[PDB]
Write a protein that binds this ligand. Structure first.
Ligand SMILES: O=S(=O)(O)c1cccc2cccc(Nc3ccccc3)c12
Length: 132
């Protein structure tokens, strides 16, 4: 259920984020900033339009979209992508494509926590957020 995602979530743990960002082109200077940072993800719905915002001292982004309906997105790291977000049995699956490249962001609730798995080819990163 989408509804179970809604609310504000605060990053508490991060695993292999640096390699994920490097895998995407994020430069060293910026990786150092982003990694010590502890972002908030806010997930909202308004009818059948979801909005996911990322709030932090590094960057601030927001996306709004319908599930299964493809959309343009400019990412935190300034990639210009084609995105699609679907719901695969409680798992929010965010697929991005740009320049023949693909990355996936999977969001699932485990133990009252929101676990985001980021995958870019072989670079995999897991980021755990606590409900606020
Ligand atoms: O986290 S995400 O927006 O998912 C994100 C996803 C994919 C690539 C990212 C690259 C740099 C920073 C991010 N965000 C970020 C925002 C605030 C603090 C630290 C990193 C990236």
């Amino acid at each position: 259920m989408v509804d179970a995602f809604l609310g504000t979530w605060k990053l508490v743990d991060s695993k292999n984020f640096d390699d994920y960002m490097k895998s995407l082109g994020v430069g060293f200077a910026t990786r150092q900033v982003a990694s010590m940072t502890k972002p908030t993800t806010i997930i909202e719905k308004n009818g059948d339009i979801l909005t996911l915002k990322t709030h932090s001292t590094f960057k601030n982004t927001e996306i709004s979209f319908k599930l299964g309906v493809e959309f343009d997105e400019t990412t935190a790291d300034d990639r210009k992508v084609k995105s699609i977000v679907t719901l695969d049995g409680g798992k929010l699956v965010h697929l991005q494509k740009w320049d023949g490249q693909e990355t996936t962001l999977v969001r699932e609730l485990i133990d009252g926590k929101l676990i985001l798995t980021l995958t870019h080819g072989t670079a995999v990163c897991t980021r755990t957020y606590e409900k606020e």
